[PDB]
Amino acid sequence: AQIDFRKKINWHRRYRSPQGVKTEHEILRIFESDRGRIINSPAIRRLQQKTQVFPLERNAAVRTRLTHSMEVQQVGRYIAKEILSRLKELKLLEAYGLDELTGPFESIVEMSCLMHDIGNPPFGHFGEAAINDWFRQRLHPEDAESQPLTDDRCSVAALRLRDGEEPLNELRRKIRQDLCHFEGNAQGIRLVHTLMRMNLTWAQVGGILKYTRPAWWRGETPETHHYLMKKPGYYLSEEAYIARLRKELNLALYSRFPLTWIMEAADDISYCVADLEDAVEKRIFTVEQLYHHLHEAWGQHEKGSLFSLVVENAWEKSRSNSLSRSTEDQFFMYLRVNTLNKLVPYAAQRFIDNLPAIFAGTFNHALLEDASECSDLLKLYKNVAVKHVFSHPDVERLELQGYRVISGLLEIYRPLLSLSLSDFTELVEKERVKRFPIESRLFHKLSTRHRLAYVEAVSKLPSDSPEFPLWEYYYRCRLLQDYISGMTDLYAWDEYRRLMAVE
Amino acid sequence: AQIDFRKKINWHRRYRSPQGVKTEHEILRIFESDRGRIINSPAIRRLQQKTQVFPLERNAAVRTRLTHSMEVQQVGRYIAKEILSRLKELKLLEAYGLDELTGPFESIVEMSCLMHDIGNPPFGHFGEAAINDWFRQRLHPEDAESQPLTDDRCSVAALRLRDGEEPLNELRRKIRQDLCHFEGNAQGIRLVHTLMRMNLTWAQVGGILKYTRPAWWRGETPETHHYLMKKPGYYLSEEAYIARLRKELNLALYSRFPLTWIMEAADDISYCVADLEDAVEKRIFTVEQLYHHLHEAWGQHEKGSLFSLVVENAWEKSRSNSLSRSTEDQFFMYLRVNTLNKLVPYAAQRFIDNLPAIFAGTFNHALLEDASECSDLLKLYKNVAVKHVFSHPDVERLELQGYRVISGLLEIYRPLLSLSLSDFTELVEKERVKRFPIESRLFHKLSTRHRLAYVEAVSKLPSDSPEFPLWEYYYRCRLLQDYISGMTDLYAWDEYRRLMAVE
Numbered sequence A, B: 001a002q003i004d005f006r007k008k009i010n011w012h013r014r015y016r017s018p019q020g021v022k023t024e025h026e027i028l029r030i031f032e033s034d035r036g037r038i039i040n041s042p043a044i045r046r047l048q049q050k051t052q053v054f055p056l057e058r059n060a061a062v063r064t065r066l067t068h069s070m071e072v073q074q075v076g077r078y079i080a081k082e083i084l085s086r087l088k089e090l091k092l093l094e095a096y097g098l099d100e101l102t103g104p105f106e107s108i109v110e111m112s113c114l115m116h117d118i119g120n121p122p123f124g125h126f127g128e129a130a131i132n133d134w135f136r137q138r139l140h141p142e143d144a145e146s147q148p149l150t151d152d153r154c155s156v157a158a159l160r161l162r163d164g165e166e167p168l169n170e171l172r173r174k175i176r177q178d179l180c181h182f183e184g185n186a187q188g189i190r191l192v193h194t195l196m197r198m199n200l201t202w203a204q205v206g207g208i209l210k211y212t213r214p215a216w217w218r219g220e221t222p223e224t225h226h227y228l229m230k231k232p233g234y235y236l237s238e239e240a241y242i243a244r245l246r247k248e249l250n251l252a253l254y255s256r257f258p259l260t261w262i263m264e265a266a267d268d269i270s271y272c273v274a275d276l277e278d279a280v281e282k283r284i285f286t287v288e289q290l291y292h293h294l295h296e297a298w299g300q301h302e303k304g305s306l307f308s309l310v311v312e313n314a315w316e317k318s319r320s321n322s323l324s325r326s327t328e329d330q331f332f333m334y335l336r337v338n339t340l341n342k343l344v345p346y347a348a349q350r351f352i353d354n355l356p357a358i359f360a361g362t363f364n365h366a367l368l369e370d371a372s373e374c375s376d377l378l379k380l381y382k383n384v385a386v387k388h389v390f391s392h393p394d395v396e397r398l399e400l401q402g403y404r405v406i407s408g409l410l411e412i413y414r415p416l417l418s419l420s421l422s423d424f425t426e427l428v429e430k431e432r433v434k435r436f437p438i439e440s441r442l443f444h445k446l447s448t449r450h451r452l453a454y455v456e457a458v459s460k461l462p463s464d465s466p467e468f469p470l471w472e473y474y475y476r477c478r479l480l481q482d483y484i485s486g487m488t489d490l491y492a493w494d495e496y497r498r499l500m501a502v503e
């Protein structure tokens, strides 16, 4: 194509948008406003109580979702800074419309780095697991694939595929697949837009759209977009938002925002090393024990290896003249540094090298893919952590616990989803209903933000339409998932216990 | 010549320093390395468990020292960005040597903003309280002030003044005043240098030196520097470091680093607004209730000016329309914004206006001088919080609790300070001592980082010297304060309970 970042770095907003002209400084200020909105957001504060690798941890020295997101933000800064430095060295900065958008470029990366994870549920993957597994038993999306049933097994009478040829059956398929396909990424878009009503710039929202697969997607993903459509990137409830976002950022269907690959790279780069640091701190293994696990896990290599210049290098450096520090602290400092100094430049280069496809958002790979020795180093760290950190019984037990907690909470609120459309809308209208004490009482438990979202969405539906009862139930289930995913590891754990009368 | 920021923004280090020439990019990378060191520092991670206004808070929506420090960092960024923008308008950027140091200028501010609370003890003005009160009743610095004296209440036989006269008594005075003058700011310098061995750039360290008063200062004086010397800025244990730092940053005795004023301004601006937001969240009062409390200090002598421009503007903007925006959330959003838009420019201008004195580090005021209507707005927020947030029984209760906890821990470890020099050094040598089981076990409880610091310091002392026993006791007390101040609110609370055999 013709790479013009002015066409992608969009400073307009969905609501009460800044309009027309705006100087270099004026545009900077717009993006700086987004930083303030995001940093002061309770959604980001909530991260210091959301788990990363070690659940419900009471050691501050261990990373939370917030401290991790903060570290990712620095890797993202370094990558963005290096992309711009090279583009300036290639003279291509002015040529790519970036000469006046240097600051926004950097800031967008840094902020979408802090905001990846914003939509993650209480017990991470076990939160995703519990939510989807609970919904999957309720409405079976398995049965919605063909045209009849003859059973369907979907408990929801409205959502069963009657029968009895209907184009309305397509909505049922979409709704059933979408509700069983909760993803932190998809929930993130829902969160920043529909639920938090942060009025971020279009460019800032494009940065947190990591995947391009619609949650309701049922088939095999297109060969050309297999990677970008890896996981669901957005829900049915956002289809319209995503559609305006696509227009506002000049994105093709299922195409990604150009700055996302920067953020994505920064994410992989920082959790790997970090997770091993935390394991040593928890006392899962010693720094010497870790070094031996890494040496095992590596190809061999060793002759003309990256292992030598990175992990071996950090190991030797941390043995002596580490007397001016401490063996383990010194090791991780060098390991981080060496990894960054080799991977950040590669990522930066990779971005610039494949910039036409990346810009188009059609590029079907990550910045640090298979074929590179660089990519292999990252895989090494991941493999060691999988085999020796994640496999730890105390970690695994909390994962099992988390799953029980989330599943339990879903079952606790189940009666709200069990109510009839008329009875539920009666509960929505007259806040407290006489014949439904328990139901009204929970309904009140749901965060006002989440409840308004339901009201707002359902209000926009045409009541007369035969689609209406199906849409209402979709949004009612969405409301519930929003509440649950919204909670911290700790709040979910407490709420579950308080509502079981075991506290 | 005169204002030359090249002479203040020092990229050199204490240990293994980068040397000679360096590219604008190369220097950027040096300061970016500091970001990485600070962000990945466990000392910063520990902040997500240290308290800000509401102690041991179980709601993630309430700020911790880390989330607040993060917010200060953004205000600092905006102030830094505005100072540079205006200097660029004025054409003074090239003239002040800043043309090539734009990034470091901003980064140094941002980082010293994030690190501003690094040295704060658990609880934490109550930690300072408990630490100083505990030490004051052990070694009364009260009696050391005057000529010796004769019956000084100092329990420490060594540190007791003569009856009698000597110049070694001056060391006793210095040691007794210093140990009773713990201050988070002074502990921060100790932390980044002696304890964490971060090896930041000289400029980066100068940024966290908020006060220029030596902890041991006994003098009532000295007008000209009465503001800069408000609180202790460094301990006796870092007198030498501070001396090298003074040389490296071309600072006069008791003169401050030019960028500190920026960081300082951001911290005040941020805390006032955030604490009122948190109070509303903690349901201490409603947003309506808050508006009425503010509509008191006003002052309606204006009658339609700054209060009407900021807080009345935020109040009116919060009423009606919203668009899934809760009146509570949108009010604080506008209050913050309006405050920033009026105070950040003032601070930025104040800095530029008094730049000669601020550069020299002789400027005896903060950027928000009491005289300004701007300064008054900040006082309004503070006053509302003082008489309606900080006065809350639950807050006050935790404060009382915190004080008992810290005092308790100090009394728990008291036997280590009770040991003779020979016995304590025997304990330091043969890690385990048979004749001292409790003392042995307690010594082991102390952080290895902290323990090494004692060893390293005492090793450097000349054993033959009559100063040696006094210096050893100073470093022994320092070691203890290091341990205690090092803990989070939670760790201190747990440790106290575990060591009371009540857990």
Ligand SMILES: Nc1nc(=O)c2ncn([C@H]3C[C@H](O)[C@@H](CO[P@@](=O)(S)OP(=O)(O)OP(=O)(O)O)O3)c2[nH]1
Pocket: A052, A053, A054, A210, A231, A267, A268, A271, A275, A390, A395, A399
């Ligand atoms: N405890 C634990 N058990 C596990 O089995 C496990 N697997 C991974 N991790 C943690 C360690 C890391 O902190 C974290 C990264 O999360 P993610 O899997 S969301 O990674 P992305 O790059 O975001 O892929 P995506 O597109 O899906 O977002 O996974 C785990 N932690």
Ligand SMILES: Nc1nc(=O)c2ncn([C@H]3C[C@H](O)[C@@H](CO[P@@](=O)(S)OP(=O)(O)OP(=O)(O)O)O3)c2[nH]1
Pocket: B052, B053, B054, B116, B117, B125, B184, B185, B231, B267, B271, B275, B390, B395
């Ligand atoms: N609950 C409570 N009770 C109190 O009595 C109190 N007093 C203040 N605060 C809290 C509210 C604020 O969030 C916090 C500010 O801390 P600070 O700024 S004082 O610390 P430094 O970095 O040393 O700068 P400086 O020394 O010049 O003040 O104090 C309090 N909080």
Ligand SMILES: [Mg+2]
Pocket: B267, B268
């Ligand atoms: Mg202050």
Ligand SMILES: [Mn+2]
Pocket: A072, A116, A117, A267, A271
């Ligand atoms: Mn991540």
Ligand SMILES: [Mn+2]
Pocket: B116, B117, B267, B271
């Ligand atoms: Mn503060």
